[PDB]
Design a protein around this motif. Structure first.
Motif, mmCIF file in Angstrom:
data_model
loop_
_atom_site.group_PDB
_atom_site.id
_atom_site.type_symbol
_atom_site.label_atom_id
_atom_site.label_comp_id
_atom_site.label_asym_id
_atom_site.label_seq_id
_atom_site.Cartn_x
_atom_site.Cartn_y
_atom_site.Cartn_z
ATOM 1 N N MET A 153 4.755 14.563 67.031
ATOM 2 C CA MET A 153 4.941 15.606 66.027
ATOM 3 C C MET A 153 5.583 16.847 66.631
ATOM 4 O O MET A 153 6.469 17.454 66.019
ATOM 5 N N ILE A 154 5.145 17.241 67.823
ATOM 6 C CA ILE A 154 5.623 18.480 68.423
ATOM 7 C C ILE A 154 6.866 18.257 69.279
ATOM 8 O O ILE A 154 7.748 19.120 69.321
ATOM 9 N N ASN A 205 9.388 16.319 68.893
ATOM 10 C CA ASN A 205 10.610 16.064 68.131
ATOM 11 C C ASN A 205 10.540 16.791 66.796
ATOM 12 O O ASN A 205 10.344 16.171 65.745
ATOM 13 N N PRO A 206 10.690 18.116 66.801
ATOM 14 C CA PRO A 206 10.702 18.841 65.522
ATOM 15 C C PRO A 206 11.802 18.383 64.583
ATOM 16 O O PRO A 206 11.599 18.339 63.362
ATOM 17 N N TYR A 249 11.016 15.159 62.490
ATOM 18 C CA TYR A 249 10.071 15.384 61.404
ATOM 19 C C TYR A 249 10.664 16.254 60.303
ATOM 20 O O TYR A 249 10.362 16.046 59.122
ATOM 21 N N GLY A 250 11.512 17.220 60.650
ATOM 22 C CA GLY A 250 12.225 17.944 59.613
ATOM 23 C C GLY A 250 13.056 17.017 58.746
ATOM 24 O O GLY A 250 13.022 17.098 57.512
ATOM 25 N N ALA A 270 14.446 29.936 63.954
ATOM 26 C CA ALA A 270 13.060 29.559 63.697
ATOM 27 C C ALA A 270 12.122 30.745 63.893
ATOM 28 O O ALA A 270 11.238 31.001 63.060
ATOM 29 N N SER A 273 4.955 17.032 58.546
ATOM 30 C CA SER A 273 6.329 17.466 58.767
ATOM 31 C C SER A 273 6.772 18.650 57.919
ATOM 32 O O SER A 273 7.967 18.963 57.908
ATOM 33 N N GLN A 327 7.889 21.929 60.298
ATOM 34 C CA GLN A 327 9.182 21.806 60.957
ATOM 35 C C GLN A 327 10.319 22.043 59.975
ATOM 36 O O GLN A 327 11.293 22.731 60.296
ATOM 37 N N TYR A 328 10.215 21.484 58.770
ATOM 38 C CA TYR A 328 11.259 21.699 57.777
ATOM 39 C C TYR A 328 11.371 23.171 57.411
ATOM 40 O O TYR A 328 12.479 23.711 57.296
ATOM 41 N N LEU A 370 13.086 25.015 60.188
ATOM 42 C CA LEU A 370 14.478 24.639 60.389
ATOM 43 C C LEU A 370 15.380 24.986 59.212
ATOM 44 O O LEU A 370 16.604 24.949 59.367
#
Ligand code: 3PE
Ligand code: 3PE
Ligand code: 3PE
Ligand code: 3PE
Ligand code: 3PE
Ligand code: 3PE
Ligand code: 3PE
Ligand code: UD1
Ligand code: UD1
Ligand code: MG
Ligand code: MG
Lengths: 801, 801
Positions: B303-304, B306-307, B310-311, B561, B630, B633-634, B637
């Motif tokens: 999860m952390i 690969n931001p 998941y976005g 971000a 997720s 992250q979205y 981003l």
């Protein structure tokens, strides 16, 4: 009628006198051995001595019908062709012999006149050749000269280095053939399975260009001094640095001349220019480079119909009157024009260790190119070694400086005492680009060169310490370095300064104190148009080509001209209002009070002083016309110079000529033919053993996992130069914006001031900035004025002595 | 050990059931005539029926050692190779026959599964093939089906169109060979002195991919249903549109299938996805196109760590849950994903006059390319005619829309009634780009396509009038067109809106009313960093490539971000302060008062409502996880999505793949050889007559003046597309800036207001803009929510019936 009787124009009286001084009956060439279809090439090189056309010989006065040869010497009868395969680096190492040094009694060259050509029309080449021939005739006619006089043409060689075998214009080639240098058949593509890098034709032509009209060129054999011609036609174009490599590294070593003169097609020297340059080099043994005044032709161009031509004319005149004299007085010239300049050959030679001006000059060609070396080239070792060497920022970007690097490398030598000098007696005329796109492309090259050369020289100023100059000479060189540092700083912030001046002047008209109603609306409209023009210029510079989108540039230039007129009007209005206010105050009127008034002082006194200095300098040089005919166009075009040219130049710092590459596969698996019958003849596997072996090979290939592969490739150089250009524009943008924010508080800085104190705090900074910039310009003008006066005084004193 | 015993995973229980339903003992192929080193090519075309490797046959269950053939049918024993020279346009006109239609009893195709490949690793192809094989096995196992059941594999053809003969990955080729489709020897480059455009291999493989690990692929012959494979390897890469031309214009006409399914390498369909798509087409005869849910694999990604993954996961989930259902409810889908979609073949066919969806789709390939047609191509006439036709702005830029044009062309047909439908039962899993550059390059293609498709559809909305739809259908299509117009307007001003929101929120913290000291300094610093990032993004987009300068993009994304986090904090702080002020006022507390408070209302109610709608929609679809794993992250981003991707996409609207061209001369004058003796053999003119004639020819050539020549060339297309891109960014910049100036009075507009009234007039406009933008977003969310609820209700109702 290609050949016509010789006719002298109104300005050809000096040529007539030269002809009177010359006998024209003792043009006897030296006998030399010829080369024998089977031909006995000298030293294993392809050399052919072919006979010249019978008509051309019949034109020559010495021709006699009775004798089969015609009574002409060997050199005048046969034209020599040589095919060069090695290339510039190894030309001297191989046994390549040029005709001037092949005589039984070797000839020592005194003046090598290099002409650079690339798809130029026959008119330009004709003009250049006419100028050179006139100069040679003058040198021959000179009587009371130790070095010149009878048989002076033997000491002069004219070298024409045409770039591009297939790009050379057909009509210029026809002209050269008419002179007798070139013939079509002789050319050979390959020799002994080796590519022919260059084709060299040698002939001592006795044909002189009588006149060069606008459309046609007329040649006549009457009263022509023989000229040694060397026409080196390159197989493939490699830009101008490669041509200069051919001239210096290869031909110069064989000939070993003195005072190499560089010319460009379409540049027509005066009747005595080359003599003046030679005398400059001869008088003082320390001089290593020289340049002459370059003029712009205004034959069939009107004052109003061609604003751009007259703007360039004023720029050239001011440069020649102020900049060159000052630098020459200091002894270090930033740039020697490539169109017309001269160098002393020994000064350029590299040291024993291999480091010298020529090495620096040439390294730019090798580094600034695609890293794709053909293993078949004989210079592969040299190029590979050069690429393997560790190159810093400056070494890898030398291509920006171009010839400019030579000047500094000459002045600041390790143990040598060299100087660069400018002589106003030598004059040459050239055609400036009338179109806007060509002007943009040409200035793009000048601006990048000047900026990089200035940065490089300033960073390496300490190299002059080890040079063997007098202590006072070093002191004055450091003074000049300081001046160039100030000039660089002023030029770096030109766009920001122009915007600040425009904004301050336009907003000043908005104040209700002075009675101008449309001030505010006009200021807002002009701000919007200014921002739009800047953004469009950036986008077009990055994206498109000038030739395509020319109308956008034309519109932007016209807008900037109108804005400049409005700014001048605003300044005059502001000054008049300020003068009126002093009288309306009711106080005593004194000369101190006018000077005390910041507005009037900065706006009027500084600009008037600069104009007066320009006017006086123009008058003292007996060249006053440009101050009237072409001043207005230059003033109106100045903002375009600063904005459009500078933006386009910086956006295209990288010059990526080379394109993408592709291996493009093409395994030759095979083909299938068709016979008379329907059956097709093919070759495919049949035996079961082979098929099973191939299948097992595929199974084993796919069975193993794929090993990791980390891309550690050196990559291509185009990314490197794209990166360098991108950083430069970003730093350029950032620094300019910081200055704008400080002066006008455009950014967040206004958040730190009060609403009632915002109006009062913005005004003081604007006034300070205006005074600073205007007086900086004025003081630089005064510096150059003093420089030029000193140059005149010292040149007159030297002439008296 | 390439072949291993079949093993079923935990999720392969359905596959086990399918195997239980299938006999696996009646895989009998149909006898067909073979083609006979001399080979009797059919219809004058190069066709070879080679035998497959003996080991591969020995693997098959039906193999018998006693019989030399092995007891296998002709189709299972021999693999067919065809060399195609004509190209897509003339493939049907020529007598090119594919094996499925060559049987004595012709086979009618029910489902053509197209797979597009280009230098893809063997793992991706293995996954796609495993999915397709599992789907075919499920279709075979189906018992109570009129169309499917026993011998269903005869109605399904899998077509693999590999783009690039020399760019295909070696391991994928090895895998295909292991399946038995491909053999190395058969390939031929030329036939009858004609280039081979494509190589087609046909074989009914009985090899099934048992499993696809991360690194290796294992194949086993145990419990495998035969699959018809067509592997069309193109000689040269022509992008994806040319591959789709091969699929539709050429292969489709010969096979004449129904329901062409488009797949992409690395996309793994579910176990019953293809059946779901086929059922969607079968139930309703009006449906002409369909798409399925696409998922992002999250197997070995944290999860952390690969931001970005998941976005993208959240983006895909929200799209599938809100956008596709609404458009499907209206009956017109803006985009059908190219990775996984399906079309009805008859719907795409052109009209008698020659105008139709396929013509529009293909014209983009021809127009968007260098105007250099080889006269030897057999499609020269077609391409020349297409280029000679007058093309407007839309026709010449169709290449932006790509497949998107097909959707609108299908819905708004002249006299046809077609609809586009989305089914959530069909699912496919794909790997999203983990790196930033690939993400930037991939979104660059999506954004340009979406923008152009929206503009094209909106401008031509009136075409739906003539379509034979019910009046209510047209009314609702117009409602959807209005929604898409609003969405386009909102998306065009995204960058300006984001900047305005950021500026308003950051400056609000600067007010002394609320007790936040670092407000002002932070706001100024963030403004400077924001402007720097925008300018750097523009410069890098125009100048450099994402792969090289990736760290700049990483830094910009991280900064955005952080800025988004700060903006959220500022909004929360602003709302809390506003709520506190109402209580500090001392007035009565009511629900109307909270709504009356503009700050609290706009900042909190709108965003909370949007989040609640997203949450409810996610829950109703039984897909709640993405709202937790997720979402963050979205959110962080999103500003990068709007700024970096949009800027890069617009700066590169033109996709100039083709490079510069050069005739490069090379006249074959000749060569000089070297004999044993020193003499060189040359060929040069000797006779005096020839030399004199050549000299006179040169004199006559140079005697005449040069005639004028006006360049009226059509020029190259790259300038046209460079021009189109430049205008688009300029208009995009101008319109956004005008909006910013109005809201904040950044330009000269502040000159029209007083210093004491500037603070009060800037606040009202900012509040109005904030409420407008936030409530626009909220209402669009509500619209999509209602859409999706309707889709669920109607789909459930149809399922019940
Ligand atoms: C009536 C005469 C008015 C003359 C005004 C001419 C402006 C020239 C500005 C200038 O030259 O700035 C110096 C520098 C450019 O240096 P320069 O050597 O001139 O250009 C090299 C060309 N290759 O480039 C710069 O630094 C530009 C500095 C800003 C220039 C602002 C110009 C404001 C115009 C005020 C006009 C006032 C008229 C008052 C008349 C009374
Ligand atoms: C500075 C302000 C500049 C404003 C535009 C001035 C345009 C003057 C003009 O007439 O140019 C027309 C030009 C002709 O285009 P064309 O030659 O046909 O393209 C050939 C492609 N090889 O180009 C055209 O025909 C297109 C017409 C202009 C399109 C809109 C321009 C908007 C740019 C302003 C953005 C402001 C930010
Ligand atoms: C490159 C050539 C152009 C360079 C321009 C550089 C601009 C520097 C901006 C300096 C600045 O701070 O402007 C003021 C404003 C911030 O202050 P603000 O509170 O918004 O307004 C105060 C009202 N008295 O800041 C601003 O106005 C923000 C500027 C707009 C940023 C928009 C970014 C996305 C859209 C790009 C538009 C491109 C520009 C088109 C212009 C035509
Ligand atoms: C107000 C006006 C003030 C003018 C003051 C300078 C006037 C000239 C004074 C010349 C004294 C020269 C003393 C000297 O020895 O300097 C070194 C060099 C002579 O020595 P050298 O030939 O190089 O080697 C042996 O001599 C030189 O290098 C001469 C360099 C002269 C450069 C003059 C540039 C004047 C313009 C800049 C003004 C600031
Ligand atoms: C948004 C603000 C971005 C500021 C810069 C962030 C840079 C982060 C970084 O560490 O990048 C270093 C990068 C590495 O360069 P390199 O990979 O060696 O180049 C290979 C060429 N193919 O690049 C470098 O090494 C050069 C270091 C930066 C040079 C100065 C950057 C100034 C740009 C800001 C202008 C503001 C306007
Ligand atoms: C493209 C992405 C960036 C787009 C930015 C668009 C900028 C729009 C500017 C709007 C504007 O009008 O800014 C305010 C200022 C005019 O108002 P002014 O009187 O100067 O200041 C009032 C003080 N309260 O106007 C200005 O500030 C002028 C802006 C500077 C123009 C400089 C042009 C040459 C240098 C280019 C710098 C490039 C920007 C670098 C930023 C980092
Ligand atoms: C607040 C919520 C209000 C919802 C109001 C709409 C609810 C659905 C009403 C459906 C009535 C359909 C009447 C009709 O005949 O429309 C044409 C078409 C049926 O006819 P057709 O099959 O196309 O041809 C024969 O039928 C259709 O085209 C149905 C299209 C339905 C689209 C619904 C989208 C709802 C989301 C947007 C909300 C705004
Ligand atoms: C004012 C003048 O009269 N000439 C200058 C002008 O040239 P101009 O603007 O006229 O055009 P170029 O700069 O391209 O030509 C410069 C010289 O290099 C030669 N050439 C050109 C292209 C090529 O591929 N190969 C080649 O050898 C040309 O024939 C010419 O002799 O701008 C150049 C910019 O650097 C300068 O160097 C020239 O001194
Ligand atoms: C999400 C997914 O799974 N695939 C999408 C992704 O592809 P992705 O980002 O993975 O990479 P590409 O867009 O380049 O490849 C798209 C398809 O075209 C093929 N190809 C590629 C290059 C080439 O020269 N020739 C060629 O035929 C590729 O093999 C692939 O089948 O972005 C593309 C942008 O349009 C989409 O069309 C694809 O649907
Ligand atoms: Mg020129
Ligand atoms: Mg892919």
């Amino acid at each position: 009628q290609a050949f016509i009787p010789h006719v002298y124009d109104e300005e050809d009286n000096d040529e007539q006198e030269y002809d009177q001084r010359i006998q024209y009956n003792q043009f006897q060439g030296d006998h030399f051995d010829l080369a024998a279809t089977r031909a006995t090439g000298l030293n294993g090189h392809l050399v052919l001595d072919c006979p010249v056309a019978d008509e051309l010989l019949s034109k020559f006065p010495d021709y006699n019908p009775a004798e089969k040869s015609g009574g002409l010497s060997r050199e005048f009868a046969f034209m020599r062709y040589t095919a060069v395969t090695c290339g510039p680096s190894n030309f001297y190492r191989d046994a390549y012999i040029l005709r001037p040094v092949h005589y039984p009694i070797p000839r020592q060259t005194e003046l090598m006149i290099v002409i650079t050509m690339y798809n130029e029309d026959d008119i330009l080449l004709g003009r250049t050749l006419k100028g050179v021939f006139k100069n040679i005739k003058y040198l021959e006619s000179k009587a009371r000269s130790s070095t010149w006089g009878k048989d002076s043409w033997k000491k002069i060689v004219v070298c024409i280095v045409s770039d591009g075998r297939t790009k050379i214009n057909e009509r210029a080639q026809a002209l050269l053939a008419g002179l007798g240098v070139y013939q079509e058949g002789l050319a050979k593509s390959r020799v002994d399975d080796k590519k022919v890098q260059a084709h060299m034709f040698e002939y001592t032509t006795r044909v002189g260009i009588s006149k060069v009209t606008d459309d046609v060129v007329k040649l006549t054999t009457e009263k022509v001094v023989p000229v040694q011609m060397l026409f080196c036609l390159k197989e493939t174009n490699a830009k101008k640095i490669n041509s200069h490599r051919w001239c210096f590294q290869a031909i110069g070593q064989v000939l070993d001349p003195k005072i190499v003169v560089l010319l460009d097609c379409g540049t027509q020297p005066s009747g005595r220019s080359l003599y003046e340059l030679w005398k400059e080099f001869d008088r003082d043994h320390r001089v290593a480079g020289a340049c002459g005044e370059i003029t712009t032709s205004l034959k069939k161009r009107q004052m109003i119909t061609n604003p751009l031509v007259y703007g360039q004319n004023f720029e050239y005149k001011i440069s020649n009157i102020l900049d060159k004299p000052t630098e020459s007085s200091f002894g270090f010239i930033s740039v020697l024009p490539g169109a017309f300049s001269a160098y002393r050959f020994i000064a350029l030679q590299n040291d024993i260790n291999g480091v010298g001006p020529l090495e620096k000059y040439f390294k730019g060609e090798f580094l600034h190119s695609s890293g794709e070396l053909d293993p078949n080239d004989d210079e592969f070792q040299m190029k590979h070694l050069m690429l393997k060497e560790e190159a810093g920022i400056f070494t890898s970007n030398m291509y920006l400086a171009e010839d400019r690097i030579l000047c500094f490398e000459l002045v600041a030598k390790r143990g040598c005492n060299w100087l660069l000098r400018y002589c106003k007696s030598a004059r040459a005329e050239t055609d400036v680009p009338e179109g806007l796109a060509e002007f943009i492309l040409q200035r793009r090259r000048w601006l990048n060169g000047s900026f990089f050369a200035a940065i490089y020289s300033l960073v390496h100023f300490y190299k002059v310490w080890t040079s063997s100059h007098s202590f006072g000479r070093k002191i004055f060189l450091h003074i000049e370095f300081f001046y160039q540092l100030i000039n660089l700083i002023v030029s770096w912030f030109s766009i920001g300064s122009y915007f600040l001046v425009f904004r301050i002047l336009t907003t000043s008209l908005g104040d209700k104190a002075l009675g101008f109603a449309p001030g505010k609306i006009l200021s807002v409209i002009f701000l919007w148009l200014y921002l739009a023009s800047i953004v469009t210029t950036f986008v077009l510079s990055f994206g498109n080509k000038p030739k395509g989108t020319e109308k956008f540039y034309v519109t932007i230039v016209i807008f900037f001209a109108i804005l400049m007129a409005y700014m001048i009007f605003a300044a005059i209005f502001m000054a008049v209002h300020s003068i009126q206010d002093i009288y309306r105050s009711g106080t005593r009127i004194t000369v101190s009070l006018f000077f005390q008034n910041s507005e009037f002082r900065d706006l009027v006194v500084a600009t008037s002083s600069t104009y007066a200095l320009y006017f006086l300098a123009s008058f003292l040089y007996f060249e006053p016309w440009h101050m009237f005919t072409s001043f207005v166009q230059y003033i109106l075009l100045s903002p375009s110079y600063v904005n459009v040219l500078n933006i386009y130049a910086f956006c295209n710092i990288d010059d990526i000529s080379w394109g993408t590459k592709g291996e493009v596969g093409g395994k030759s698996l095979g083909e299938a033919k068709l016979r008379e019958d329907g059956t097709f003849d093919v070759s495919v596997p049949i035996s079961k053993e082979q098929i099973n072996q191939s299948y097992l090979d595929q199974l084993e290939k796919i069975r193993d996992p794929a090993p990791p592969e980390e891309k550690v490739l050196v990559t291509n150089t185009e990314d490197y130069y794209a990166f360098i250009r991108s950083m430069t524009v970003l730093v350029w943008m950032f620094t300019n914006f910081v200055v704008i924010a400080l002066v006008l508080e455009t950014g967040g800085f206004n958040q730190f001031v009060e609403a009632t104190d915002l109006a009062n705090l913005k005004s003081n900074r604007a006034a300070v900035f205006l005074t600073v910039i205007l007086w900086t310009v004025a003081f630089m003008a005064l510096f150059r004025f003093i420089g030029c006066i000193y140059y005149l005084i010292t040149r007159l004193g030297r002439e008296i002595k």
